[PDB]
Structures are given as C-alpha cells and as structure tokens.
Amino acid sequence: APATIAAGATGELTMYYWVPLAYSETDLTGAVLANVPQSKQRLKLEFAN
Amino acid sequence: MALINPQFPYAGPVPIPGPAPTETMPLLNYRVEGRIAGIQQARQFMPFLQGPHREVAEQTYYAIGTGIQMGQTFNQPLINTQEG
C-alpha cells in the first residue's frame, strides 16, 4: 500500500487474508468435510466503504 | 450422513469429460543392477582414540630401601644407687 496518496493522485494496494478452517497444515481440527454436503457453503465478506 | 431433500432431490452422478485414460496409468519404473563402488579399506586413521579414559588421576608408588643401619653412641644413664 502506498504510505501517502497526494492530492490528485491514485494509489494501488493489495492485501491477503488467510481465513482458517483447519488449525494448521498438520492438524485437521476445525476442518469441514464437503464431499456430499447438506447445502451450499457461505463466505460472507463485508468490504471497506 | 446428509438428509435427503424430498422437495428437491437429485440423482446419481452423470458422465463428464475424462482425463485421457492412459495418462492416469503410470509405467512400472524398471530398476537396473547397482554396485557400491570401489575396494574398501580395512581400517581408518581415526581422529579420536577408541578406548576408555580416566576421570581422576591416582598417585602411584614404588618401594625403596633405606641403607645399612649402623650402631650409635648413646648417652648412658647414671647408676640407680637410691637416687632416681
């Protein structure tokens, strides 16, 4: 992200998020079995206004 | 362990395009014969000794003799003539 956007300028900015379901790559606690599920899954994402 | 929706059920899987069936079958990898190469030496000039060591040092001794024992000129006492 640019540290300062001046007057009349444009700033391009990127961000990554890891939304966890399992605990780690070796610990599968929290994971979701989704082969034959009951319905769809949802990932609600509210963004900045 | 899903519950069947009676209002909107679905059927089993239908055929879909496939991944070219021989390309999911591997070859069985064909090992040739091998050899641990070279003539091995019988012993190695090791950087550490292979035996035990001692934690503490103990004092050792050896016996010695004294010498030829001589006589002496003693200072001799006085005669016990009822003064002693």
- Residue B81 φ then ψ, to 5°: -95, 55
Does the beta carbon of B3 lie under 8 angstroms from any beta carbon of chain A?
Answer: yes
CA nearest neighbour of A22 among A14, A33, A11: A33
The angstrom resolution of this structure is 2.8
Among positive and negative, which fits the CA dihedral B72, B73, B75, B76? positive
Q: What approach was used to elucidate this structure?
A: cryo-EM
Please give the structure tokens belonging to residue B55: 């934690």
Q: Which residue of A has its CA nearest to B4?
A: A38
Does the beta carbon of A37 lie under 8 angstroms from any beta carbon of chain B?
Answer: yes
Please give the structure tokens belonging to residue B64: 């010695």
Q: Which residue of B has its CA nearest to A37?
A: B2
**Pairwise CA distance, residues B56 & B60, whole Å:** 13
Does the beta carbon of A26 lie under 8 angstroms from any beta carbon of chain B?
Answer: no
Q: Which three-class secondary structure state does DSSP give residue B23?
A: helix
Contacts of A38 in chain B (CB under 8 A): 2-3
Alpha-carbon torsion angle B13, B16, B22, B27, nearest 10:
-50
Please give the structure tokens belonging to residue B49: 């000794």
CA nearest neighbour of A38 among B3, B63, B67: B3
Q: What is the largest CA-CA distance in chain B?
A: 148
Contacts of B2 in chain A (CB under 8 A): 36-38
Please give the structure tokens belonging to residue B46: 């090791």
